[PDB]
Amino acid sequence: LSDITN
Amino acid sequence: FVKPYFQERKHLVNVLLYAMLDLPEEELKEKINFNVDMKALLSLVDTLHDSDIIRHAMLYEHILNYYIAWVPKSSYIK
């Protein structure tokens, strides 16, 4: 899905 | 140049403030042991009382106006 949040 | 001579005299503070507030001569004579000229008193009262000497609209007017006309130990010269 990517777009991994911190 | 003159103020030290005023501080030299003692009764100056009391008489001047009483002159400022325009107190009647009766209260002067109760606790002051030296004569005070009533004619001098009336004359100094007359001299003391001598007087011959929306909010967004002012910002445009006055702020601009103060710079429309301008000429070049603190001020102390009021």
């Binding site: 899905l1 990517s2 777009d3 949040t5 | 910002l59």
Partner: protein, 219 residues
């Protein structure tokens, strides 16, 4: 005396400034499609409505294009120079302006993504058409958009705010705040920003974009 009077006409000050009591906050436009209103119907074309299937989105994508092109209007989307903030080597802005739902453009770079629309001649834009897909592209959905205006890259200035909650359809934005008399926008420089996506996204797609302006024989 003609010189003195015209100078007053070019730059009226005492007549113009009423109170000088502007609120100076940026106006925010609501894009939600759950409330029915006359003003919203003017800016939202596809109509208020489970999440539709992608083919239904493609079908409504074409019907939205047809309705927007149905009215008397001139399309000059291809009459301007485009320069996005960054590519990703997979899809340039051509697939964003190809009027096809299947193909789309993607940027890749800094978080405040920029989309530049430069014009060659003074064109008077009246309606700007943009298509969103919240359910189809939720990962790269544009959540906050700020549209600028200006005559040059030098004098770009803020025009309007746009907040995205749920809009799976074409969005029409005619301009009236700038000029009430003309009911249209007059600029040569338009740029778009996408500072943040939905659910804390990183990048952003753009499915469709269009620009709208007004105006026996021998073969």
């Amino acid at each position: 005396i003609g010189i003195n009077k015209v100078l007053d006409h070019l730059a009226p000050s005492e007549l113009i400034k009423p109170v000088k009591s502007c609120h100076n906050k940026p106006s925010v436009l609501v894009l939600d499609d759950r409330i029915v209103d006359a003003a919203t119907k003017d800016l939202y074309v596809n109509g208020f409505q489970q999440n539709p299937t992608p083919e239904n989105l493609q079908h409504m994508f074409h019907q939205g294009i047809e309705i927007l092109d149905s009215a008397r209007m001139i399309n000059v989307t291809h009459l301007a120079l485009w320069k996005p903030s960054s590519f990703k080597l997979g899809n340039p802005v051509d697939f964003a302006l190809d009027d096809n739902y299947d193909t789309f453009w993607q940027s890749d770079g800094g978080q405040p993504h920029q989309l530049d629309i430069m014009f060659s001649k003074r064109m008077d834009i009246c309606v700007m058409a943009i298509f969103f897909s919240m359910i189809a592209d939720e990962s790269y959905a544009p959540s906050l958009v700020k549209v600028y205006a200006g005559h040059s890259p030098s004098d770009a200035r803020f025009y309007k705010m746009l907040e995205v909650r749920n809009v799976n359809g074409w969005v029409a934005l005619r301009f009236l705040d700038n000029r009430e008399d003309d009911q249209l926008l007059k600029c040569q420089f338009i740029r778009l920003l996408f500072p943040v996506n939905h659910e804390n996204g990183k990048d952003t797609h753009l499915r469709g974009i269009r620009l709208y302006v007004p105006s026996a024989i021998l073969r």
